[model samples]
Target: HHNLALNKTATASSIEGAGFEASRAFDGSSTTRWASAEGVDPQWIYVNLGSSQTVNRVKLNWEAAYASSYTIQVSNDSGTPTNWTTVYTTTTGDGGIDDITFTARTAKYVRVHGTVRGTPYGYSLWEFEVYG
Candidate 1:
């Protein structure tokens, strides 16, 4: 299982700056990063795998401004998905590479929902990878 989320369609609640778009986080570019607006709660980023994928693990490369608490959710909506089922959650995240694993679930949409930020800034990440 490779990075199913690589170069996939991505969207976010908000961006910190003009170039910091949600797609940047999944572009596999070490230079670019997706950052949410500073000093906020409930920021999130989700990706479209295009087709149904049996995903068991998600790895996030955080960029300083990371999430202190977050949840991993899955959905199957073809258009803009809304009905998400949360499969994994944590309230003790440290800013860095987070290799999280959960029960394998088939989903076309995957999300990283941030409940709280680690710093005063909002959630940010260099890469968001999902694997089977």
Candidate 2:
């Protein structure tokens, strides 16, 4: 399947710079990335799939500052009823690349929530690709 998250609307907890914007993570490019503010725990980035979709895969392309612990979450509702469900979790994340495959889930929004930092720097991702 193709990457459903490519060029989609997204949001981030914080950004490292204008050049390392959140949108770069899902633009399907390896040259660009999304970097969060340094030394922060529980930093996050979520993408809206435009509509409800059945997603089963997520490929995280990490930079030097990667997450030590994180979860892949999803939600179907909006406007205060956004109930997110955790589809994947990792406590021993050895960054570089995390290609996750899970049972298909229906959702409109998908997020990467990082709780533990592998380095003193914040979590960074070159690409956050989602597929059905």
Candidate 3:
């Protein structure tokens, strides 16, 4: 399943227990959002792999102008996060939307951790997709 946020605010508030370090402004554009507590930023998105399956490709369609540094984490439930894993890490200044593809792994959920928010506003994701 794939979802796109062509317009409107695509806030990362959907992430469970997600707390923002700065007052991020999404405004239907490339924006960075982060979750931080005790100087550690742990912003992640939960993607259900659908019935204990394996994922070969992990893609992140971030906003156009917004960028930040992040790492990937895997979990089993979208609600109860666990089995967190780091798949990839990169800085937003590197340019282009982040689309990371990795080897197959069985999981039901995934999270993108923000090690650092490029603009302090945080990491933005107009859309996040998982395939294969």
TM per prediction: 0.95, 0.95, 0.60
Error of 2 at 99 (Å): 0.9
Clashes of each: 0, 0, 6
- In Å, residue 92's CA in model 3 sits off its true spot by 6.1
Which run of 10 residues does model 3 get worst, by summed lDDT? 2-11
Looking at candidate 3, what is the lDDT of residue 73?
60
Clashing pairs in 2: none
Misplaced by over 4 Å in model 1 are none
Compose the digit string of candidate 2's lDDT tens values, residues 61-97: 9998999899999888864325779999989998999
